[PDB]
Amino acid sequence: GIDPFTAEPIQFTKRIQNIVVSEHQSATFECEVSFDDAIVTWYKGPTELTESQKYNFRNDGRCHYMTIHNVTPDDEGVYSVIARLEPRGEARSTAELKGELRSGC
Template identity: 35%
Template sequence: MSWRMLLILNKIEESVEALKVSPSSTFSTFRLALPITFKQELKNQEVEEGNSATLRCELSKAGVQVEWWKGDVGEELLKSGEKYQMRQTATKVELVIRKAVPEDSGVYWCIFLFSALPVTFKQTLRNQETVEGNSITLRCELSKPGASVKWWKGQEVLSLGEKYYMKTEGRIAEMIVRNVVFEDAGSYSCSIGDQKTTSEIKVRGRSLYYWDSFFYQVNFFLNIRYTIWPFVFRHCF
């Protein structure tokens, strides 16, 4: 949504120029109901050469980012500096054109910007369990590619290094925890903006893991012995 005004510089006398503002008009390239509107529109003004002109309007909501443009179709984006000063207080925005000269004549636009949709998590982290000495990969998927994420353990922000390897390719964000030890167990999170996904990581001792594996195999063969062999003897002998 934008608001435009036409600044016309007319000659009053040989050494004095006047800055006149024609009636303003609005236009929009959007064909939907907009949640933000102009409560106060730009007004006609007149200023002498060498003085400053202040363009002022008011929005229906505070904290909205605006841009000021110059040109028949808004081809020049104005920047705050020696010539232009931009001010914004709550819903009120202003553009001050300092030391007006004939070249300042033209069409000026005030345009407010729509915030992009926030990035969210399409696929969240999942809880995992691993054995000490191994590496573990935490993975989540974002709704948009190229977003910057942060990785956490509890309340601590993690950094790329020997222990942690982080990468984001497209919409997939990953962190690898290398050479896992018991102290690596805990809550890990990936955040973007105010969005966060969390997983719990459990670490088992390698010796305990092997004993569990051993007893599982023993139990497996015992089950075979007491279930398969009676069947074999009954039908084959």
């Protein structure tokens, strides 16, 4: 009749948003999800992001954080977060990265 709530599709309530970051600073895309058992991977363009003393991935219950250190104009682009669990209805979200210009006199 009606599918169970637990198997219902997973979506990001917070829905990451666009970030503007100074060249020497760091960018963080924060997301929140319906289930805490979901597995999340961040994507930049066709390339997936992995740790290399470059990307810091921190998990906190339903909350998942990704921090990028040393952002370049080149690095500006689109970042996505995808949450996956056994077939329940996967979700995809996007956000844009922008490089803030350094201030001066």
